[PDB]
Amino acid sequence: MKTVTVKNLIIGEGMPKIIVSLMGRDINSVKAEALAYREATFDILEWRVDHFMDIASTQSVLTAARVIRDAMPDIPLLFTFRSAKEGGEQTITTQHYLTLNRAAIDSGLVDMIDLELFTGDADVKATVDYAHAHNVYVVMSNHDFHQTPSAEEMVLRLRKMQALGADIPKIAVMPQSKHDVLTLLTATLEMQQHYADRPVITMSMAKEGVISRLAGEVFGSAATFGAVKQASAPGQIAVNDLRSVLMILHNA
Amino acid sequence: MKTVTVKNLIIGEGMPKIIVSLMGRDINSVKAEALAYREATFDILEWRVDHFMDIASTQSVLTAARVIRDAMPDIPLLFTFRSAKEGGEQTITTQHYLTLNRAAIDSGLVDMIDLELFTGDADVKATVDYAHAHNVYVVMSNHDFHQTPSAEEMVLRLRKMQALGADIPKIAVMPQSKHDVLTLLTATLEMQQHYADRPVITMSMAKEGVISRLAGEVFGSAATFGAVKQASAPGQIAVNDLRSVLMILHNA
Numbered sequence: 001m002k003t004v005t006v007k008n009l010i011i012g013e014g015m016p017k018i019i020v021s022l023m024g025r026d027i028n029s030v031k032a033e034a035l036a037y038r039e040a041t042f043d044i045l046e047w048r049v050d051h052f053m054d055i056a057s058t059q060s061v062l063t064a065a066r067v068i069r070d071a072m073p074d075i076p077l078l079f080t081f082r083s084a085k086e087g088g089e090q091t092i093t094t095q096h097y098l099t100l101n102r103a104a105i106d107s108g109l110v111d112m113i114d115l116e117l118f119t120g121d122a123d124v125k126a127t128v129d130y131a132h133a134h135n136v137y138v139v140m141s142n143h144d145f146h147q148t149p150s151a152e153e154m155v156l157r158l159r160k161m162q163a164l165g166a167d168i169p170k171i172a173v174m175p176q177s178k179h180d181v182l183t184l185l186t187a188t189l190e191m192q193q194h195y196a197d198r199p200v201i202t203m204s205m206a207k208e209g210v211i212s213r214l215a216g217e218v219f220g221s222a223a224t225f226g227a228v229k230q231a232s233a234p235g236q237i238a239v240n241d242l243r244s245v246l247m248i249l250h251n252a
Numbered sequence: 253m254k255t256v257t258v259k260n261l262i263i264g265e266g267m268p269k270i271i272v273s274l275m276g277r278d279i280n281s282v283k284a285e286a287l288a289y290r291e292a293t294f295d296i297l298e299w300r301v302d303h304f305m306d307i308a309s310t311q312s313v314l315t316a317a318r319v320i321r322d323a324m325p326d327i328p329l330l331f332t333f334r335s336a337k338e339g340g341e342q343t344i345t346t347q348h349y350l351t352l353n354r355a356a357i358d359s360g361l362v363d364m365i366d367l368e369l370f371t372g373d374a375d376v377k378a379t380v381d382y383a384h385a386h387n388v389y390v391v392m393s394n395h396d397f398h399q400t401p402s403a404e405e406m407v408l409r410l411r412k413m414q415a416l417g418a419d420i421p422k423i424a425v426m427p428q429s430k431h432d433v434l435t436l437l438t439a440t441l442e443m444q445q446h447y448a449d450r451p452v453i454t455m456s457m458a459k460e461g462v463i464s465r466l467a468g469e470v471f472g473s474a475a476t477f478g479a480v481k482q483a484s485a486p487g488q489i490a491v492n493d494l495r496s497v498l499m500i501l502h503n504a
């Protein structure tokens with residue numbers, strides 16, 4: 001497996017890495033959240049850019065990224081604009097999405113970007129290449145907030161992300177039953193056992209899916225999301241409790 | 253679901269109940285373990301009779317049961333002779349197994365007994381009837397310490413235990429792969445959602461299976477074993493850590 005090492009953190013080995021999302025509506029709230037987050041314990045900071053209400057200005061977006069970087073200079077920083085199509089807070093044009101991501105990449109302020117698989121193949125390849133040209137890793141992503149696809153369809157998507165050059169494929173799906181949670185775990189393990197060429201992140205969302213956020217070490221999810229004070233998706237638990245469970249499982 | 257209530261403990265609702273096994277060779281060792289276990293927090297005490305030396309004398313076995321009952325008067329007490337055939341510490345004749353179990357039952361000293369499904373149909377039925385006639389619950393059990401049967405075979409076993417009057421069907425199986433852990437979870441969920449009318453206990457043993465000991469509330473296992481200082485089977489984790497995880501999952 002080609003692991004991803006960012007600021008001395010090895011993604012794809014050991015205990016799943018803990019990601020938390022920063023959500024602030026404006027520059028002052030982003031600053032305050034970045035400061036407050038320093039005392040929480042986690043491995044990677046995701047900035048959920050689609051929660052920022054001045055995405056209209058590239059300057060405002062980059063200044064917010066810089067505020068976060070300056071508060072947490074040694075933390076892996078992941079820039080994520082979640083599109084409305086895939087469960088995010090606001091709709092913007094594909095060109096605006098690509099522009100924000102390219103600006104994040106070439107600014108040097110972030111270590112990683114989230115790129116949605118179904119943005120379009122040509123645009124995805126171009127943006128992956130641009131990320132790599134500037135020493136930025138790509139978490140390539142897919143979300144189903146309505147239901148859980150078959151294990152086979154989930155594996156297909158993850159393999160497509162690999163084929164497009166993703167550093168870390170990621171899929172999040174919504175269970176409609178406890179059975180659907182097992183389907184997600186099954187897909188994760190299939191990736192782990194058979195298509196194991198780089199780290200993958202998976203999760204089944206919502207209350208029923210919580211176990212999938214805890215069991216990454218066993219079935220092969222390289223990272224997991226917790227909540228500092230507000231969750232960025234259904235099913236995230238308090239980050240200290242997440243960490244406690246991951247440690248108990250790792251040492252069992 | 254019809255629950256099983258013992259000494260104010262409701263098995264089959266809420267958080268999975270914590271069972272610990274007491275293992276001692278003789279009266280003094282059983283006393284020392286019972287005393288040490290006062291510092292631990294758990295829901296049910298299993299006496300693993302097959303770890304006792306003088307199992308030949310019904311009197312010796314009953315005197316030890318009485319010592320444990322009197323050491324822990326308010327704790328649900330489960331009498332378990334695990335046969336060597338099913339992963340226990342020593343062999344026993346079927347007739348002497350019946351004698352010990354009947355004596356335990358009619359002594360008033362125990363709340364529950366473990367009865368192995370594969371003991372034989374006549375002996376199982378007679379012992380279930382005897383248990384019930386004396387207000388003792390039956391944990392009817394099956395263990396494979398080598399491998400994991402198919403989910404279909406496991407579900408059929410659990411349903412057979414229900415049909416034979418088990419108060420709590422129980423199966424423990426050994427994974428040879430991570431896939432086998434998911435098979436056990438699948439069987440558990442199937443049984444709980446489609447066939448069970450009473451609590452069931454399931455586990456995938458060993459390190460690989462530990463998630464099954466943690467995820468009972470989600471997939472349908474009503475109880476789980478932890479270790480105070482020594483495990484009674486591979487994969488049991490420290491009882492306080494078990495409790496921490498169960499609480500986090502329950503409140504998620």
Ligand SMILES: *C[C@H]1C[C@@](O)(C(=O)O)C[C@@H](O)[C@@H]1O
Nearest residue numbers: 021080172203205225232233
């Ligand atoms: C990757 C994606 C995962 C979540 O949807 C989740 O934890 O379910 C949260 C989002 O903030 C992430 O971008």
Ligand SMILES: *C[C@H]1C[C@@](O)(C(=O)O)C[C@@H](O)[C@@H]1O
Nearest residue numbers: 273332424455457477484485
């Ligand atoms: C019921 C059975 C379960 C264990 O084998 C286990 O936790 O895997 C432990 C034994 O002591 C129990 O009798």
